[PDB]
mmCIF file of C-alpha atoms in Angstrom:
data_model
loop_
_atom_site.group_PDB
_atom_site.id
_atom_site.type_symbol
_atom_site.label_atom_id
_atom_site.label_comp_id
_atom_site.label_asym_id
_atom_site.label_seq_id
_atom_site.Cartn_x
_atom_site.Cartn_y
_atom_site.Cartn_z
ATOM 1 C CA UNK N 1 100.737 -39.620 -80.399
ATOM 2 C CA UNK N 2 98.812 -41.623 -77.744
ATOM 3 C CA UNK N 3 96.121 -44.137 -78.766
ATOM 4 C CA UNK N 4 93.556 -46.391 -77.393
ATOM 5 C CA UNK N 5 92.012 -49.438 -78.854
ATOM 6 C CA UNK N 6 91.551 -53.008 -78.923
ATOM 7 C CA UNK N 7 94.302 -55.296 -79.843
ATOM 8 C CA UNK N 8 94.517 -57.666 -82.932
ATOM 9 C CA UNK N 9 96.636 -60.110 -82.057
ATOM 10 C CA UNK N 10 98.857 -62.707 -84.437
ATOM 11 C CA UNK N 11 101.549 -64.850 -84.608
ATOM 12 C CA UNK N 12 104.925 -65.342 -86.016
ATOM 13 C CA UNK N 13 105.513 -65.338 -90.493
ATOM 14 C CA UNK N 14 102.757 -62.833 -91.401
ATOM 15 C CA UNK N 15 103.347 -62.242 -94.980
ATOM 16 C CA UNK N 16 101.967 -59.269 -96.930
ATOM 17 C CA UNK N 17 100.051 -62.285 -98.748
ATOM 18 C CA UNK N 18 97.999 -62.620 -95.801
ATOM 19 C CA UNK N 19 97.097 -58.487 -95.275
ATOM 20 C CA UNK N 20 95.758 -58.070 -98.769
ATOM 21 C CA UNK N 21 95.207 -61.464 -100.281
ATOM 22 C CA UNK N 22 92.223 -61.597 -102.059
ATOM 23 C CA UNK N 23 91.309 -57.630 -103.906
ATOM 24 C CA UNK N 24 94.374 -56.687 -103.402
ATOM 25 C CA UNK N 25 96.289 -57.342 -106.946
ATOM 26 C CA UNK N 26 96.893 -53.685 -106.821
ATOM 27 C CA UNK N 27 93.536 -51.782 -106.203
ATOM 28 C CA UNK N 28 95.184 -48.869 -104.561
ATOM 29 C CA UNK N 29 91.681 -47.852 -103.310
ATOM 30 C CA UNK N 30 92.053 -47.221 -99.503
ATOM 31 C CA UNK N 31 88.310 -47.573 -99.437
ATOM 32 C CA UNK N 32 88.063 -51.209 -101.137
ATOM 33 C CA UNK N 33 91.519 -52.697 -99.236
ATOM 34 C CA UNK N 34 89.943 -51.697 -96.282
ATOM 35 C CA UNK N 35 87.086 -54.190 -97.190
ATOM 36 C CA UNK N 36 89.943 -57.257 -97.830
ATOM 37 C CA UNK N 37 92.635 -56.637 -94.519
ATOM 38 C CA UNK N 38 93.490 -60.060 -93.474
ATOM 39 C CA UNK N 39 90.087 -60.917 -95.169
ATOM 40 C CA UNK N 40 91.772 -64.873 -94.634
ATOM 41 C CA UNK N 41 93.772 -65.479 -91.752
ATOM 42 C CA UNK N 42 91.016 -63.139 -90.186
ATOM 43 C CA UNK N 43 87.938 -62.907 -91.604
ATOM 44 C CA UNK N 44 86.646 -60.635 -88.522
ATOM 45 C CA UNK N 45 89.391 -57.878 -88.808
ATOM 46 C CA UNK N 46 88.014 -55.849 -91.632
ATOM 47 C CA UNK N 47 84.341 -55.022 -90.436
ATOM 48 C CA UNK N 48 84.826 -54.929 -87.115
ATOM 49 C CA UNK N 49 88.579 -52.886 -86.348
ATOM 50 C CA UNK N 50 87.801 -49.186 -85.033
ATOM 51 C CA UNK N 51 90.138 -46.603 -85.324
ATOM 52 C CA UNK N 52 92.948 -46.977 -82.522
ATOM 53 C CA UNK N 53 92.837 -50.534 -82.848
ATOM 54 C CA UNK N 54 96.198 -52.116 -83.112
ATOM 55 C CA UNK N 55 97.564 -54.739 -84.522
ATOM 56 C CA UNK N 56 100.130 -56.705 -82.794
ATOM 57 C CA UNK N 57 102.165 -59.692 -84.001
ATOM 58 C CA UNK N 58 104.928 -61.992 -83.500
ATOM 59 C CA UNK N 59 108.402 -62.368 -85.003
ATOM 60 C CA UNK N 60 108.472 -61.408 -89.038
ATOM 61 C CA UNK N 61 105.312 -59.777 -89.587
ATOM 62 C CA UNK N 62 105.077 -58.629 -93.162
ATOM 63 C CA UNK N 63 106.992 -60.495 -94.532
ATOM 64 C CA UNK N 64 106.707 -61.464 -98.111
ATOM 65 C CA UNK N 65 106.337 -59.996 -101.486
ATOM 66 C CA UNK N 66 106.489 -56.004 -101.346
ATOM 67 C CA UNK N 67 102.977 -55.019 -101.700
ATOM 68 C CA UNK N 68 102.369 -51.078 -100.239
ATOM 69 C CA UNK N 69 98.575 -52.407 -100.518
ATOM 70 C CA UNK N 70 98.965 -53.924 -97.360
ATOM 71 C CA UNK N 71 99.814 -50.418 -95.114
ATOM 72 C CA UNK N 72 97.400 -48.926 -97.102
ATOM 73 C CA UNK N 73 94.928 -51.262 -96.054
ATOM 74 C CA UNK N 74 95.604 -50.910 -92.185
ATOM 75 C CA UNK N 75 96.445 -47.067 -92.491
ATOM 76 C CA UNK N 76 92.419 -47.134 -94.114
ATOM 77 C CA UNK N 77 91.438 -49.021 -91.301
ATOM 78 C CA UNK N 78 92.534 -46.233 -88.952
ATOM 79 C CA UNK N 79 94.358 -49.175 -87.145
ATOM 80 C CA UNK N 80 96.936 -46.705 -84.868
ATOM 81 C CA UNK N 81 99.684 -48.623 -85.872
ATOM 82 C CA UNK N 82 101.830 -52.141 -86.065
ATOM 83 C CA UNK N 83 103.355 -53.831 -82.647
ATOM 84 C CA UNK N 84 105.413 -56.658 -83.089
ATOM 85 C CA UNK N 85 108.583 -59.002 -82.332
ATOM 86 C CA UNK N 86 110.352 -57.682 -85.934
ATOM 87 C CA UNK N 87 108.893 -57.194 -89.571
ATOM 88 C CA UNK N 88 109.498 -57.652 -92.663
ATOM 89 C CA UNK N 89 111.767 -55.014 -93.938
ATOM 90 C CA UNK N 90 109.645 -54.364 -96.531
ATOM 91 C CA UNK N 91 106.630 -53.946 -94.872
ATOM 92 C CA UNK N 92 108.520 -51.615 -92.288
ATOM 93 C CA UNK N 93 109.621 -49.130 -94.830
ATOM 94 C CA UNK N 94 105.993 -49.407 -96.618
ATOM 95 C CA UNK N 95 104.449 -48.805 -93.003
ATOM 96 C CA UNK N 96 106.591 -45.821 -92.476
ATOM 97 C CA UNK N 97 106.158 -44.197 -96.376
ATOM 98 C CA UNK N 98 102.077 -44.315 -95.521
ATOM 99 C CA UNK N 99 102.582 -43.165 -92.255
ATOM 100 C CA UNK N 100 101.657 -45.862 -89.602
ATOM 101 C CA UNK N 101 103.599 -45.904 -86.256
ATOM 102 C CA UNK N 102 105.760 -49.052 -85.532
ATOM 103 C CA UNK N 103 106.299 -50.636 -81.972
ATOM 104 C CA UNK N 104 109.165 -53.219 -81.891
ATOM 105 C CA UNK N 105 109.039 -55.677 -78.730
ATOM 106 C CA UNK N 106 107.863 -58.954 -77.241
ATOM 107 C CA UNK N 107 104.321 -59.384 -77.598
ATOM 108 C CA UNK N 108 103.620 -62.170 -75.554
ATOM 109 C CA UNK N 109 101.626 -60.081 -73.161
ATOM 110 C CA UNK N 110 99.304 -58.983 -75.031
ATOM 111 C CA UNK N 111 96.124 -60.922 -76.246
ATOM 112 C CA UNK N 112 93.821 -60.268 -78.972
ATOM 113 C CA UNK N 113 91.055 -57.792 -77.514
ATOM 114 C CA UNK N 114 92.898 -56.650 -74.957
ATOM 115 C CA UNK N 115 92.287 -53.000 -74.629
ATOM 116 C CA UNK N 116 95.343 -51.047 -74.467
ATOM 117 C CA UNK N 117 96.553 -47.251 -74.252
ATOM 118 C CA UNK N 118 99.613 -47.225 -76.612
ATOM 119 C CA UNK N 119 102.083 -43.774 -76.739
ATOM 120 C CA UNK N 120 103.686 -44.268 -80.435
ATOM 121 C CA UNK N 121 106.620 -41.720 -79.558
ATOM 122 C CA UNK N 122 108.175 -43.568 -76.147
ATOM 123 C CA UNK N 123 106.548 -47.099 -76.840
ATOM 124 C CA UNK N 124 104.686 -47.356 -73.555
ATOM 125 C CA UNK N 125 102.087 -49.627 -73.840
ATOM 126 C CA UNK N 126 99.110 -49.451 -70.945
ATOM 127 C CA UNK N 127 97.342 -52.540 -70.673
ATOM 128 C CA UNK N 128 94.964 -52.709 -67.431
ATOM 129 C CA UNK N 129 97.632 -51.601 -64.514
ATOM 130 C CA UNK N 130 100.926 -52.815 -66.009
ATOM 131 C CA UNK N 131 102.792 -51.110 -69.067
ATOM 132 C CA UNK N 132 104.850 -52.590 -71.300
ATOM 133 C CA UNK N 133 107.441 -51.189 -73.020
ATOM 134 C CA UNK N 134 108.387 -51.300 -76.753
ATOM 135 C CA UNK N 135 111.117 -49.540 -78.910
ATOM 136 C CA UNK N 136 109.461 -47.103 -80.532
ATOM 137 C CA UNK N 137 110.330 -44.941 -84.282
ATOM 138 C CA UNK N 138 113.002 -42.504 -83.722
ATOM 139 C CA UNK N 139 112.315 -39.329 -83.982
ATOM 140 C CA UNK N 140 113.221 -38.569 -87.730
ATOM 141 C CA UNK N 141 110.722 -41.194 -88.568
ATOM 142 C CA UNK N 142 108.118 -40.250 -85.788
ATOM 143 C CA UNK N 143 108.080 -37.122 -87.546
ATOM 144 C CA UNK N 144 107.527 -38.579 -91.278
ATOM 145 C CA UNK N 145 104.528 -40.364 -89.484
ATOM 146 C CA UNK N 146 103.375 -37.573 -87.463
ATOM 147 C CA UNK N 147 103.161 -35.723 -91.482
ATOM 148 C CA UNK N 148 101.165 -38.398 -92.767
ATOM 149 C CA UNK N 149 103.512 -40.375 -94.981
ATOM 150 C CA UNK N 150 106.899 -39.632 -96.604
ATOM 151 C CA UNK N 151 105.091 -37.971 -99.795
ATOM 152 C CA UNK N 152 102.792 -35.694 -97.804
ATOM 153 C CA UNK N 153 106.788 -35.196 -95.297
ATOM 154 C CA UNK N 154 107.619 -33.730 -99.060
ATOM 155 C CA UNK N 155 105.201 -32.029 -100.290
ATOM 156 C CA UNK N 156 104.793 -30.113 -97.247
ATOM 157 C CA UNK N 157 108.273 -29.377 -96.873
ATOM 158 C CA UNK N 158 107.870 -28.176 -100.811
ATOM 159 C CA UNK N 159 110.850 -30.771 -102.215
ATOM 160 C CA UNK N 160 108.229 -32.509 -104.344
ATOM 161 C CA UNK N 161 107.972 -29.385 -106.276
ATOM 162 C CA UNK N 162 110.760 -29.593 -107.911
ATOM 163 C CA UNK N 163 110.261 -27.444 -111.294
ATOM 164 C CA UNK Q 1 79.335 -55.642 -61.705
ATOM 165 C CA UNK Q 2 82.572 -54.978 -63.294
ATOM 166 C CA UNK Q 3 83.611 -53.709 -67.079
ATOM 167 C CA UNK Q 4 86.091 -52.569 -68.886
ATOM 168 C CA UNK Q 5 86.226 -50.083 -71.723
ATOM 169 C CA UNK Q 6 87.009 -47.017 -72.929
ATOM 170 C CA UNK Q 7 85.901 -43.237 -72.006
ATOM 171 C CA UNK Q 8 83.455 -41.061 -73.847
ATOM 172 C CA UNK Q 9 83.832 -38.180 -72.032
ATOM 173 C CA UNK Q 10 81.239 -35.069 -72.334
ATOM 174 C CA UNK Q 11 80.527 -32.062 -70.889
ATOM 175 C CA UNK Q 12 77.880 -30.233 -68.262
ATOM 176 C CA UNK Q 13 74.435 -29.899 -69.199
ATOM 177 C CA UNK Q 14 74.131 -32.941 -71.992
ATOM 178 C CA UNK Q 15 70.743 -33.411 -72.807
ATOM 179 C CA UNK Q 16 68.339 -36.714 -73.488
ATOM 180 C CA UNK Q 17 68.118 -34.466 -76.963
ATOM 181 C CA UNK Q 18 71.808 -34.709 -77.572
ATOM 182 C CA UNK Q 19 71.866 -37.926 -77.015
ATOM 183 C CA UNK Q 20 68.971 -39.168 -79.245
ATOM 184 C CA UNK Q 21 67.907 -36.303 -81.286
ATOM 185 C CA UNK Q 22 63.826 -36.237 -80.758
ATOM 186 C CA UNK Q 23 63.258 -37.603 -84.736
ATOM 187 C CA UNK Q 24 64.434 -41.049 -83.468
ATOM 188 C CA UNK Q 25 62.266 -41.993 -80.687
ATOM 189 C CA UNK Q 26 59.680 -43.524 -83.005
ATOM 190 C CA UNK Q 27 60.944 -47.504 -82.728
ATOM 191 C CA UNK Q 28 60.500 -50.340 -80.567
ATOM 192 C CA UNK Q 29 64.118 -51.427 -82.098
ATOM 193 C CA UNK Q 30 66.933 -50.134 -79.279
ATOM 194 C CA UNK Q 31 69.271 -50.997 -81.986
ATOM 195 C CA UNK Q 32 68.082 -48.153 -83.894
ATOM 196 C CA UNK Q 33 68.438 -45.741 -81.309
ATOM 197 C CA UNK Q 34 71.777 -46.841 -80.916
ATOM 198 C CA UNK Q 35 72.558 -45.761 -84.122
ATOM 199 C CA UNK Q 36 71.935 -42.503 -83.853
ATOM 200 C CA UNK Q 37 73.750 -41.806 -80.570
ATOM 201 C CA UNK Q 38 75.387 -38.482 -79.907
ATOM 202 C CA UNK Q 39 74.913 -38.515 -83.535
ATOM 203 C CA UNK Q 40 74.848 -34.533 -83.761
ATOM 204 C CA UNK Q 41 77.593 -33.777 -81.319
ATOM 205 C CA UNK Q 42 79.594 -36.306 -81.581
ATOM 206 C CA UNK Q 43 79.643 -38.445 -85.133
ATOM 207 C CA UNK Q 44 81.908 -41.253 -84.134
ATOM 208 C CA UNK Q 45 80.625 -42.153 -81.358
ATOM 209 C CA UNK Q 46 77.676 -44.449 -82.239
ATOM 210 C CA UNK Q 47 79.651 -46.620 -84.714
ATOM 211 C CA UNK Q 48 82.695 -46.726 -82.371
ATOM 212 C CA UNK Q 49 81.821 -47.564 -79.265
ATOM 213 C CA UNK Q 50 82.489 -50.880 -78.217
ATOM 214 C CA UNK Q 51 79.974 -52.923 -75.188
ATOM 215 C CA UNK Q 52 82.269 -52.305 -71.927
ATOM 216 C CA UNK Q 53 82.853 -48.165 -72.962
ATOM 217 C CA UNK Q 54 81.618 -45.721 -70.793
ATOM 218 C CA UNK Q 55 80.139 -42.460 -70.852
ATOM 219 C CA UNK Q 56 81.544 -40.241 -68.319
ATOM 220 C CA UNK Q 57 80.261 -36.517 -68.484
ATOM 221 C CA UNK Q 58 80.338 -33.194 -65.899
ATOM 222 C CA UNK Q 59 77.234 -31.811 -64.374
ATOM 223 C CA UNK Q 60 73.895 -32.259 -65.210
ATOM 224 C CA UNK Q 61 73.968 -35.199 -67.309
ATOM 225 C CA UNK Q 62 70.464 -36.530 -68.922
ATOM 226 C CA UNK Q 63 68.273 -33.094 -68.756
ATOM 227 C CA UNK Q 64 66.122 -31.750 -70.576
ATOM 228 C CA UNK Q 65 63.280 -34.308 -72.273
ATOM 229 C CA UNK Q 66 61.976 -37.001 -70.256
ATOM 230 C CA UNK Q 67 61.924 -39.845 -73.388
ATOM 231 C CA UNK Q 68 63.665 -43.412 -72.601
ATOM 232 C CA UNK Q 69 65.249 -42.889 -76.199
ATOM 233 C CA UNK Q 70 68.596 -41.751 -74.132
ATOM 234 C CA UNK Q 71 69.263 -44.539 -71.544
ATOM 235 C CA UNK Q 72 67.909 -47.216 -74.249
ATOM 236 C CA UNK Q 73 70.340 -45.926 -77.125
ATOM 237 C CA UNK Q 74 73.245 -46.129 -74.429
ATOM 238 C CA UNK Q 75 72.103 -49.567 -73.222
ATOM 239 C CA UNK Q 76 71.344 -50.991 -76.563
ATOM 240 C CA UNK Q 77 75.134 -49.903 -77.351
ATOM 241 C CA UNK Q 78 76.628 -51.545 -74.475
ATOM 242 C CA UNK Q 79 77.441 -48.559 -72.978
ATOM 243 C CA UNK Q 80 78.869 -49.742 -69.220
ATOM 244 C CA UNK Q 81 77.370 -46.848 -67.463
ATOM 245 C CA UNK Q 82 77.516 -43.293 -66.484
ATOM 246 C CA UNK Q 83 79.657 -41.658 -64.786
ATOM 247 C CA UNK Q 84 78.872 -37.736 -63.705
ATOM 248 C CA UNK Q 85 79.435 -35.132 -61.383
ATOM 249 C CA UNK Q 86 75.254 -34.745 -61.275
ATOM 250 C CA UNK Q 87 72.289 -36.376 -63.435
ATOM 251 C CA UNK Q 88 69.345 -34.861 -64.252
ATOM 252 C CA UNK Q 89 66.239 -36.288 -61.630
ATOM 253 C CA UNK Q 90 64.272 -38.031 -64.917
ATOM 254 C CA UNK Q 91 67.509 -39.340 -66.631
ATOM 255 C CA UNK Q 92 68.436 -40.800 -63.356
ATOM 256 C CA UNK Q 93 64.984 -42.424 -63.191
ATOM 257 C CA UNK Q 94 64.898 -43.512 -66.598
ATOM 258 C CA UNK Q 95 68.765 -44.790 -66.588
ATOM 259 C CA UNK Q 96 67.169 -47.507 -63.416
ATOM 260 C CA UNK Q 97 64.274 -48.431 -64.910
ATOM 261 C CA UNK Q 98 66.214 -49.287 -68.253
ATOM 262 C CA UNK Q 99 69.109 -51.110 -66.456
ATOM 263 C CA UNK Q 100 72.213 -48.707 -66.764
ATOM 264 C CA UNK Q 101 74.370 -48.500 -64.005
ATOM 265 C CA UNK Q 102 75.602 -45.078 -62.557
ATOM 266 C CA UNK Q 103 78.470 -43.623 -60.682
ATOM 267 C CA UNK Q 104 77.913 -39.898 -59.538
ATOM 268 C CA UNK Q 105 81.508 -37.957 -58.412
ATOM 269 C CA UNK Q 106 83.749 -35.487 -59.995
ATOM 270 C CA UNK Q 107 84.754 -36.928 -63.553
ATOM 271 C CA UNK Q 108 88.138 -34.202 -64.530
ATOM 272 C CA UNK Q 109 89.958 -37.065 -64.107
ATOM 273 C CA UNK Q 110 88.754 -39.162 -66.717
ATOM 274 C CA UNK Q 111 89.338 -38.310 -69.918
ATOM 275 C CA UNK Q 112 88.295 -39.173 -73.673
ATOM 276 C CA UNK Q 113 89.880 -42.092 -74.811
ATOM 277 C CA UNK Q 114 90.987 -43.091 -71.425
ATOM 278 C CA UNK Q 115 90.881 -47.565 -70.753
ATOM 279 C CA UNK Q 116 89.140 -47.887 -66.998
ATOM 280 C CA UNK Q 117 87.879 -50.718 -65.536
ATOM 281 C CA UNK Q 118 84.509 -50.079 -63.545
ATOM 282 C CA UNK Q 119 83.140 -51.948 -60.257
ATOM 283 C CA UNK Q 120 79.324 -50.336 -60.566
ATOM 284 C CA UNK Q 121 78.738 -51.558 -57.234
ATOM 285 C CA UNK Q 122 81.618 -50.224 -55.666
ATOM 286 C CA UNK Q 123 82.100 -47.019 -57.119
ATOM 287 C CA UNK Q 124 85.369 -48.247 -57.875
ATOM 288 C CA UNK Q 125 87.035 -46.741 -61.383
ATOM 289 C CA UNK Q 126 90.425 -48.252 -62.150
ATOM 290 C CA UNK Q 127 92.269 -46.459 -64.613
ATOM 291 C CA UNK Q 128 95.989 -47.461 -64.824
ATOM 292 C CA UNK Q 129 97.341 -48.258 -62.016
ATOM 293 C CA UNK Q 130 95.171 -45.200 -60.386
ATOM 294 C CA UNK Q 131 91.762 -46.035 -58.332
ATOM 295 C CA UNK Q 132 88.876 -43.391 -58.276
ATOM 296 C CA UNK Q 133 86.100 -43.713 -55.857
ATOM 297 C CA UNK Q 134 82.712 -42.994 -57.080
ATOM 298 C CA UNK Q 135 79.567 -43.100 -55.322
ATOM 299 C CA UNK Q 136 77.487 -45.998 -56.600
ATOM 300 C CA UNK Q 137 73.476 -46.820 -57.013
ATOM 301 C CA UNK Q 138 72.441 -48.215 -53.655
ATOM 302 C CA UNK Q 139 72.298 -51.934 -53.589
ATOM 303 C CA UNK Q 140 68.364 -51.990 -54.287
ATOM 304 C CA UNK Q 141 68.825 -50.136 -57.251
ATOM 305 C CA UNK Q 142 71.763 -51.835 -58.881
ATOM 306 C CA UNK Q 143 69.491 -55.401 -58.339
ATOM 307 C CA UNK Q 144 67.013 -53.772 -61.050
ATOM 308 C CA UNK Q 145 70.334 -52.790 -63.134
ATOM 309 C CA UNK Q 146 71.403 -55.887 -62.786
ATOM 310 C CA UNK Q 147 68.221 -57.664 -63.590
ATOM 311 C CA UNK Q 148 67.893 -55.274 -66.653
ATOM 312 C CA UNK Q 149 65.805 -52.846 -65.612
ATOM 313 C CA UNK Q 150 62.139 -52.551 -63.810
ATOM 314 C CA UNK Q 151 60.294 -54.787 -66.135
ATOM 315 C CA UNK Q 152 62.588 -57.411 -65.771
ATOM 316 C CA UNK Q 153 62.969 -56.990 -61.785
ATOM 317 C CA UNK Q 154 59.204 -57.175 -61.732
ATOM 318 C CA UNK Q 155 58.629 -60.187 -63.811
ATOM 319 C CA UNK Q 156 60.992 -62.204 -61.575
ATOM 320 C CA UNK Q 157 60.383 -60.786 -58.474
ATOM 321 C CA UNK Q 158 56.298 -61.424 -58.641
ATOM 322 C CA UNK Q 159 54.475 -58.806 -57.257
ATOM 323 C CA UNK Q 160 52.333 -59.534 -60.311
ATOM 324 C CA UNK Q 161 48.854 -57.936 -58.021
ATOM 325 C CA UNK Q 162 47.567 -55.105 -57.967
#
């Protein structure tokens, strides 16, 4: 899975808080948490992310209370998926169960709008003539993304019907 | 001259139609023609495309109807330019005397999606760490580009008498 987008860049301590403050007590809705994503820290993320965008961060990001509302609201976003320093393990597993690709790596280099050309599987990360590499999902994970979340990985697969 | 986006890439024969569907050229608002961009063909590209992106396409890009509509939905978008194998003779016309820049060589190396960085005077596409050389608007032509377009050029370069 290759992408291409602009980046969204933040720092270090994002907490789940912070992706879906304000709509977010529970709302499922992908359409209306789309409407609230970082609505605070960055009130310019929601309306004007396009799909492929990414979102890259510092150390910790997601930390926090374990809201799923906030991968919901990037994976309604389209955003092509999370680059950071480390998350919140909390957030990581809710990224991965709604199927968003994770990048793990120093994200120093990389400023927000940079445009950038990121490969999901190896972590390769094109920004203007350099790349920059990042650890990427392994594959067992790569391929619960690739299905579109761990319950469409199951109900594919057919182990959700159980009977 | 230089910008940075992504591609849009197209095929041959894209027509001033395709790219603003005749029931749109009724507006003296460019921002409404940019709406409606590619709209039949290609959906996402109006409300995607970002000021820097460029639309690179095969032969015979622009034909067909000779309305502005095309190169001022592209410009209004900030569409960077356009980058063909061939342009149709109006579109070419029309694309100057808007103010779009345009690169004419063979385009199967660029591809949807792709980041390049564009020197409209030089012909120069950076993509990666990989350069391809385009053939550029002449230097009299890019000064109306750069002015933004004919009516502009004219107003600051007098001339004002008939």
């Amino acid at each position: 899975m290759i992408t291409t987008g602009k980046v969204w860049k933040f720092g270090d301590d994002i907490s789940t808080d912070e992706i879906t403050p304000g709509r977010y007590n529970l709302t499922k809705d992908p359409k209306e948490l789309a409407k609230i994503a970082f609505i605070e820290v960055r009130p310019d993320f929601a309306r004007n992310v396009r799909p492929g965008d990414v979102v890259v961060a510092g150390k910790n990001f997601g930390i926090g209370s374990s809201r799923e509302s906030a991968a919901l609201a990037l994976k309604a976003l389209g955003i092509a998926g999370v680059i950071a320093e480390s998350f919140g393990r909390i957030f990581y597993r809710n990224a991965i169960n709604i199927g968003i690709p994770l990048l793990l790596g120093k994200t120093e280099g990389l400023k927000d709008g940079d445009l950038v050309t990121v490969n999901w599987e190896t972590g390769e990360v094109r920004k203007g003539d350099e790349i920059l590499m990042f650890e990427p999902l392994e594959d067992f994970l790569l391929e619960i993304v690739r299905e579109g979340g761990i319950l469409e990985y199951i109900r594919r697969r057919g182990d959700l019907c159980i009977r």
